[PDB]
Amino acid sequence: RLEQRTRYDLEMMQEIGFCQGIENYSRHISGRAPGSPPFTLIDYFPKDFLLIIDESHVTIPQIGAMYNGDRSRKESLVEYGFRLPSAFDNRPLT
DNA sequence: CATCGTACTGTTACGGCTCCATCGATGGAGCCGTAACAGCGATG
């Protein structure tokens, strides 16, 4: 199943260039090293920017929970041979 | 020019009968293309 899905995605990339499911190969596309965090809106901001968190006692746990939720969702997919192991890097920042 | 002789022949108009030539369109159904609509997990 993994081979069939990857072959279909590779053919779609070679012929057209972009399609659904292209987000799972973000690490390969951007050339990032394994385990590196993805570029985000904070990276777009200048290094001398100012950050304000409104209702911090609620916002901060929301920031924390995204990575755990995404990893829990993707663990079953990667385990059962549906997506490549590199799909773990298409994750929100810890 | 006058009179007489036991119901005369042939050729044309006109009405009725019959044969023959001459002559796509509309609604229903199926299909294609296009627009429209409905229908996981972790944390505090």
* One-letter-per-residue 3-state SS of A24-83: HHHHHHHCCCCCCCCCCHHHHCCCCCCCCCCCHHHHHHHHHHHHHHHHHHHHHHHHCCCC
**Method of determination?**
cryo-EM
* DSSP H/E element including A12: helix A2-15
Q: Could you give the 3-state DSSP secondary structure of residue A85?
A: helix
Distance A62 CA to B31 C1' (A): 54
In angstroms, the CA A75 to CA A1 distance is 16
Q: For strand B, list residues 48-77 of chain A whose Cβ lies within 7 Å of it.
A: 61-62, 64-66, 68-70, 72-73, 76
Q: Which nucleotides of B are covered by protein (CB under 7 A)?
A: 40-44
**Residue with token string 């399609």:** A19
In angstroms, the CA A8 to CA A5 distance is 5
Resolution, given in Å to one decimal, reads: 3.2
